[PDB]
């Protein structure tokens, strides 16, 4: 039948892709960076502790000014913190308490949230009445919302559990573009620094690179053995990091179109919830299910330090724009700033 | 406060007011009864609903308590990716239809509905998140099932069975079959009720089970256990 011919052609294409990727691997990243000096031991201590959430904290995000942050908890609360003075700026009660994602607009005028209600809610912060009110309610996904990211004041990108991603025009509340191709729940997304492409990681143990305007999949990266939970983009914009349930982190290059480095240890067997990069891109911070955060030398693939101050699973972490601190949230209803 | 300016002091006062509001809301929501509905296929959800896409929430007050009821039957995604969001609910109400003892699924051959319901109970009961959560097992359609034994014996579900073909014992055999799936018989137990058409015993049994669960939760908090 025609389906047999088509699947044989697909297998031939896969073999050709594998051969093309194999022919490009002459040297490894470890060999090239074998003689570079190590970073030593990274010692960081807690400076601030933000209290006020009475349930598990599920997401957090940093502002562009590197002073305000937002955090969502599964008690129907979206709290905006001023980290310098620990003061609370705003507390927003959500209509649905099963929130699972957060986003802060780059301009600082809007916040976005969503979760098990299959709806992305956009709240306006600057009003003439002095209260934060719901400005938009985007609907159309058929699965729980897992990640959302602003592009500007009038464009958002969301990923959800129906194996699809969407680009929404906020003003009209319509799905401008739909990205399809994943065979499992999409768990994370990350925008490029120039905001023209984005990478998405799903439960089919694969990551995909999407062009925002064209809505087409450019490259697919494989290698993980379980569901991918976190994805982060390298500061340069030519590589990215992936964390999954098999207790390993991996680094992928866009131009080489293959894998570069693997970060794993024999004493780590739990899953990874979050990944982030430092300002220069030399350190990679990953939060684990064993209540810890690990700092990895991104070049030599060596353990550098640990952050251990949480009594439950670490669920989210983020590095400020100027790289002066790192914020870590956890299921024990606390957030901590480290530097 | 020695060096704080006027606006800094006002911001601190605003944050204090926000904290007070958060504390009040948390202490109000702490004394609430939250139930999670579970089942396989269509076995009775609206009928279990007694006002006395996404996730469906139902709020009702019985005597002076606030009852929240969460139904996630419309979620078609992977269960293991959000099942930890409900770690901390007061009780899990699992509904099972007794009429599925002889009729199998037509979508997939040899997939009996009762056997397909036992696997879900096995997964939910023995879970890393629900080790201590109380489970209330409802066995619905008792009457309609009762008259079906006259034609098809229980061997259609469990061929390794021999006993009187009456309701009063065949139903108890299923009662035992579902209860033995629990591998944590100590420090955890199941309250099983046979659903009746009187429309009042269901809420009374649920209230009794919830009261017994809250008593054991209070025992741990006040250092007696």
């Amino acid at each position: 039948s025609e389906l047999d011919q088509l699947r044989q052609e697909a297998e031939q294409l896969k073999n050709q892709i594998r051969d093309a990727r194999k022919a490009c691997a002459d040297a490894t990243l470890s060999q090239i960076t074998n003689n570079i000096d190590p970073v030593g031991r990274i010692q960081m201590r807690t400076r601030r502790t933000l209290r006020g959430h009475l349930a598990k904290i599920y997401a957090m995000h940093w502002g562009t000014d590197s002073r305000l942050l937002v955090s969502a908890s599964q008690d129907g609360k979206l709290i905006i913190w001023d980290s310098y003075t620990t003061n609370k700026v705003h507390a927003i009660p959500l209509r649905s308490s099963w929130v699972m994602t957060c986003a802060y607009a780059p301009s600082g005028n809007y916040v976005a949230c969503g979760g098990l209600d299959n709806i992305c809610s956009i709240y306006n912060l600057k009003t003439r009445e002095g209260n934060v009110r719901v400005s938009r309610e985007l609907a159309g996904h058929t699965g729980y919302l897992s990640c959302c990211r602003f592009l500007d004041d009038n464009q958002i990108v969301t990923s959800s559990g129906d194996t699809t991603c969407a680009l929404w025009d906020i003003e009209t509340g319509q799905q401008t573009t739909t990205f399809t191709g994943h065979t499992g729940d999409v768990m994370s997304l990350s925008l490029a620094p120039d905001t023209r492409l984005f990478v998405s990681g799903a439960c089919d143990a694969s990551a995909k690179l999407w062009d925002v305007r064209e809505g087409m999949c450019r490259q697919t990266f494989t290698g993980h053995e379980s569901d991918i939970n976190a994805i982060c983009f390298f500061p340069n914009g030519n590589a990215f990091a992936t964390g999954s349930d098999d207790a390993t982190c991996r680094l992928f290059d866009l131009r080489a179109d293959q894998e570069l480095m693997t970060y794993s240890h024999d004493n780590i067997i739990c899953g990874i919830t979050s990944v982030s990069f430092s300002k220069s891109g030399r350190l990679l911070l990953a939060g684990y299910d064993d209540f810890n955060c690990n700092v990895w030398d991104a070049l030599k693939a060596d353990r550098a330090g640990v952050l251990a101050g949480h009594d439950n699973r670490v669920s989210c972490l983020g590095v400020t724009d100027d790289g002066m601190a790192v914020a870590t949230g956890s299921w024990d209803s606390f957030l901590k700033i480290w530097n | 406060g020695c060096t704080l300016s006027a606006e800094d002091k006002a911001a601190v006062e605003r944050s204090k007011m926000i904290d007070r509001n958060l504390r009040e809301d948390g202490e109000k929501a702490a004394r609430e009864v939250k139930l999670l509905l579970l089942g396989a296929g269509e076995s009775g959800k609206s009928t279990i609903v007694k006002q006395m896409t996404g996730i469906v929430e139902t709020h009702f007050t019985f005597k002076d308590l606030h009852f929240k009821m969460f139904d996630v039957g419309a979620q078609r995604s992977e269960r293991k990716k959000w099942i930890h969001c409900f770690e901390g609910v007061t009780a899990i109400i699992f509904c099972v239809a007794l009429s599925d003892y002889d009729l199998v699924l037509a979508e997939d051959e040899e997939m009996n509905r009762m056997h397909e319901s036992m696997k879900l109970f096995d997964s939910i009961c023995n879970n890393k998140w629900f080790t201590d959560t109380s489970i209330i097992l409802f066995l619905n359609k008792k009457d309609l099932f009762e008259e079906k034994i006259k034609k098809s014996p229980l061997t259609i579900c469990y061929p390794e069975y021999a006993g009187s073909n009456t309701y009063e014992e065949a139903a108890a055999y299923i009662q035992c079959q579902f209860e033995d799936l629990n591998k944590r018989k100590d420090t955890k137990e199941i309250y099983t009720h046979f659903t009746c058409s009187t429309d009042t015993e269901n809420i009374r049994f649920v209230f009794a089970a919830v009261k017994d669960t809250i008593l054991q939760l209070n025992l741990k908090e006040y250092n007696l256990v």
Epitope: N87, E129, N131 | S5, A10, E13, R14
Partner: single-chain antibody, 232 residues
Framework: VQLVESGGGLVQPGGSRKLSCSAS????????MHWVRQAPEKGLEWVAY????????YYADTVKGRFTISRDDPKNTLFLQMTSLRSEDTAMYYC??????????????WGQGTTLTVSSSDIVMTQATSSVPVTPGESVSISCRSS???????????LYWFLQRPGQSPQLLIY???NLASGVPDRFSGSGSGTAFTLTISRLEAEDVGVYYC?????????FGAGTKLEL
């Protein structure tokens, strides 16, 4: 957003009265409130302040022990009860809203005040100008000076620039010496140092005529400048 004042009228010396300010169109309970009075032909003068939640109250030295400020939040109203009124208390009173958090703009709305006529350590803000004859289409520069340093240890300089058009309530132009208020054209700019401050207007549009005031918010006894008048 609206604030409406009621009260005023002829009062004999030694009498009492209750001025009221009714708010509509915004969350009243989230805003701190000020009473600010202006004499018949004088400059602005701060009178009293009540915090959100009524947790903090501040009075001026002239009215301390005589005036009382209160708020009713369910009714969305603000009261000023005045007793033992002297002949120097004849003025127009405004109720002003102000909210304080990181990045907020206090003093951003002024009600249309009510007139009262009675029958017959502190930072000093100097505006050493009275009248500036001007022509449309040319830049202007108003200057204000303080007797202290308004720059705090956290890098914030607490200076505010307000404009009062003839026959209108004052409106906010600049807050914290550099931040332009919402709804203000880009022509207005603020700059300065710890002590000397300058407000620059790039191109006049024959509408900016009026009196410009500089106010300090470093410490709660609030001081206004004498004011600078722009006439053509």
């Amino acid at each position: 957003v609206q604030l409406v004042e009621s009260g005023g009228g002829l009062v004999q010396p030694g009498g009492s009265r209750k001025l009221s300010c009714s708010a509509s169109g915004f969350a009243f309970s989230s805003f701190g409130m000020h009473w600010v009075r202006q004499a018949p032909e004088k400059g602005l003068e701060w009178v009293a302040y009540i915090s959100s939640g009524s947790g903090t109250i501040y009075y001026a030295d002239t009215v301390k022990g005589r005036f009382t400020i209160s708020r009713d939040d369910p009714k969305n109203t603000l009261f000023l009860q005045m007793t033992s009124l002297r002949s120097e208390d004849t003025a127009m009173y405004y109720c002003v809203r102000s909210i304080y958090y990181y990045g907020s703009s206090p003093f951003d709305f002024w009600g249309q005040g009510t007139t009262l006529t009675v029958s017959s350590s502190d930072i000093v803000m100097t505006q050493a100008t009275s009248s500036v004859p001007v022509t449309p289409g040319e830049s202007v520069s108003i200057s204000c000076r303080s007797s202290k340093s308004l720059l705090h240890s956290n890098g914030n300089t607490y200076l505010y620039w307000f404009l009062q058009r003839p026959g209108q309530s004052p409106q906010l132009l600049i807050y914290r010496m550099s931040n332009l208020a919402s709804g203000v054209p880009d022509r207005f700019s603020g700059s300065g140092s710890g002590t000397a401050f300058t407000l620059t207007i790039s191109r006049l549009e024959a509408e900016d005529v009026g009196v410009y005031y500089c106010m300090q918010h470093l410490e709660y006894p609030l001081t206004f400048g004498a004011g600078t008048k722009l006439e053509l």
